[PDB]
Structure formats: C-alpha cells, structure tokens
C-alpha cells in the first residue's frame, strides 16, 4: 500500500496549514493594541494562504494519489484559473509590505501623515485589481484546443505564455524588494538615533528584521520552480524527468503550510497573543 502514506502526510500538512492561517487572523482580530496599517497586510497574506490551502491543494492531492482527473471538464479550468491568482496575490502583497517599510524607515517623523488609513486601503484595492488582471490576462490569450478523453488535465507549454508568466509574476516584484531593502540597510548602517528616543529606535529596528525573515523564507521556497521551468520550456535539450519535477512545485505549497510558525518564534507580542487566543 503506497497511497496511505502520501494521503496521511499530505492530509496532515493541509490540516496544519488551515489552522495556522486561521490562528494568525484571529490573534490580530481579537486584540486591540495590534491595530495599525502594517498588521492588516499580514492579515491579507494570511487570507490568501488560507484560500489556497483550503480550496486548491486537496484536488491536487487526489490527482497525485489516483493518477487521472475524475471530476469532469468544467472544473479542470476553474482549478487552473484559481491556482495562479492566489500565488500572484501573495507575491504582490509581500512587495507592498516592503514599500511600506521603506517609507516608514526613511521619513520617521512624517510617517503618520503620509501613510494614512485611506491610502492603505486604496493601495490594497489596486494590488488586488492588478493581480487579477495580470493573472488571468495571458491565460485567455494563448488558448489551445482540448483533447477528447476528458480524464486528463494538463498545462500550457507555449514559450510566450511561460515567458510572460515568469516575467510578470516572479521577477518583477523581486527587483523592487531588493532595491528597497538595499537602501534601507544602508540607512540603518549609517545612522545613530532614528526617531529621537531610544525606545522608538529599538522598536523600529525589529519589524524590519521580521520582514527580512519572511522574504528570506519565500525566495528560498519559490526560486527553483521559476528557475527550472523556462529553461526546460525554451531549450528542450536539458529538460528534466517527470520525478524531479514533482518536488519543485510541492516546495511552494510547503511554504504556505510552514509560514505561520515564524511569528511566535521571532516575536514577544505574537506569542502572548497566540497563548491568549488559545486560552479561550
């Protein structure tokens, strides 16, 4: 019996991820001193990972266990259209947290007049609209005809679609993140006292470290898939086998299941908030 092991492992991982991403939302939505414009973006990342790990991953698990799509033809398009939108929304959410931290560090005295509540909400709406456009843009542009067996659900391999998706979903926010963090690290290295007091300085110097840990986990998890796909799509000589392909896109789902453990370990308000939520 080989299906039992994979079924138990993937079911346990999904059932861990759903409860983690519910607990992250509940710990911010319960307490009152955690109400600022920075924590709402963490709630947004938790919402995107919750929708992914509660809608998409069971059907790919059953597809990996059985070996053929046994639900029809209309669901094979809806699944492959939600699977791209969730990852694109998560990457652009990380990019907007990086921009917010740069504006917070570089102008430490005129921050509560620049980043108000209204501009944060409008930036959230603009990010969701741009993600929904750039995700399902090229999916309906490189449309190929369907086979005649309907027990198979495959993906596109036109080099235009692969190039457009890999250029508009991964390598465009990465440059913005690295430019903002390079300028922020130079300013933190060269200065003595940021906000005119010791307490505000030592409180400002730690959220940047937490967001560095989050970005460092995300890049390490999602880089080999977006590095092994277009090389095999363009140059067909160095295409790998069908067994090493199936790990480089399961790492990207392990990332969504492993994300909510960073906040209790690398903080002291999140641990108290998690314990207070679990107390009830």
């Amino acid at each position, epitope marked *: 019996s080989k299906a039992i092991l994979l079924g138990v492992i993937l079911g346990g991982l999904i059932l861990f991820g759903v409860l983690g991403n519910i607990l992250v939302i509940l710990s911010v939505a319960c307490h009152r001193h955690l109400h600022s414009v920075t924590h709402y973006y963490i709630v947004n990342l938790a919402v995107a990972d919750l929708l992914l790990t509660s809608t998409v991953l069971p059907f790919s698990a059953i597809f990996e266990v059985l070996g053929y799509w046994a639900f029809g033809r209309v669901f094979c398009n809806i699944w492959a259209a939600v699977d791209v939108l969730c990852c694109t929304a998560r990457i652009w959410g990380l990019c907007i947290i990086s921009i917010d931290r740069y504006i917070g560090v570089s102008y430490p005295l005129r921050y509560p007049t620049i980043v108000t509540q209204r501009r944060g909400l409008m930036a959230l709406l603009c990010v969701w609209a741009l993600s929904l456009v750039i995700s399902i843009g090229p999916l309906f542009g490189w449309r190929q005809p369907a086979p005649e067996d309907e027990t198979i659900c495959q993906i596109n391999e036109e080099p235009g679609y692969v190039l457009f998706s890999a250029l508009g979903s991964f390598y465009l926010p990465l440059a913005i993140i690295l430019v903002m963090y390079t300028l922020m690290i130079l300013r933190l290295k060269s200065v003595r006292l940021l906000s005119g007091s010791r307490e505000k300085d030592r409180n400002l*110097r730690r959220i940047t470290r937490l967001v560095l840990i989050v970005v460092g986990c995300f890049v390490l998890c999602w880089l080999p898939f977006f590095l092994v796909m277009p090389i095999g799509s363009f140059f067909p000589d160095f295409k790998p086998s069908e067994t090493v392909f199936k790990i480089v896109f399961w790492l990207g789902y392990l990332n969504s299941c492993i994300n909510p453990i960073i906040y209790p370990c690398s903080s002291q308000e999140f641990k108290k908030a998690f314990q207070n939520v679990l107390r009830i």
Partner: nanobody, 116 residues
Framework: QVQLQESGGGLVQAGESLRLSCAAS????????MGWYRRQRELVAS???????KYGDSVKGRFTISRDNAKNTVYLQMSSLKPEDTAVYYC???????????????WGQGTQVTVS
C-alpha cells in the same frame, strides 16, 4: 561585554603638562561618542564620531581633545595646570553590538591626578 581601560595618571607640582588616554576592548559594532568627566559628574571634554569637538565652561579651552578611530582611543592633553585641578577624572563611551540592537553606554574605572 565591552570594557574600557584608562592610562596616564601622575602627581606633580603646578606648572607642568600631562596626557591621559582611554581605550575600549571587547565585541563592538561601532562607537559613537566619548568624553571626560571631572570629580560628582560634570563635563570637561567631549568629541563625536565625525570630529566636531566641544568643551566646558570651567575650563577656557586650554586642554586638547583628540581621537584615534582605528584603535578606538581618545586622548587628553593638559598644559599649564592650575592648583584648583586636584580631582579624579573618569572616561565614558557609547557603543552598539549589532545592527538590530539598542544604543547603550558604559562608564569606566577612573584615574587620579594630584596637583598643588
């Protein structure tokens, strides 16, 4: 765990010259400020990281303050000493021990100079 060491004490009559020195040792990321304090705490000399010096009111600038950055050392040159300068002098420093850390200072032991 950063510790400071002082040197340059003595005991002589009035109308002479001397030089004191202070130096840090330990694990440091950067040093931001140094100085000297008489007796009771009061300012007599203070220098910055850039080089813009400052002085105190009880002394009319007759001493000299200088800083060696690469060895983490601060000096003090005293000349034409008055009989009213018999006290105990102390060093000081400010530092940091990491880029994600908190600024915190630390005092030193002290040195004795006796003049008549």
């Amino acid at each position: 765990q950063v510790q400071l060491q002082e040197s340059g004490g003595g005991l002589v009559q009035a109308g002479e010259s001397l030089r004191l020195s202070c130096a840090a040792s330990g694990t440091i990321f950067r040093l931001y400020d140094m100085g000297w304090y008489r007796r009771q705490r009061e300012l007599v000399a203070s220098i910055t990281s850039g080089g813009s010096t400052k002085y105190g009111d009880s002394v009319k600038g007759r001493f000299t303050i200088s800083r060696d950055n690469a060895k983490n050392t601060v000096y003090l040159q005293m000349s034409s000493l008055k009989p009213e300068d018999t006290a105990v002098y102390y060093c000081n420093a400010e530092y940091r021990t990491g880029i994600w850390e908190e600024l915190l200072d630390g005092w030193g032991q002290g040195t004795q100079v006796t003049v008549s």
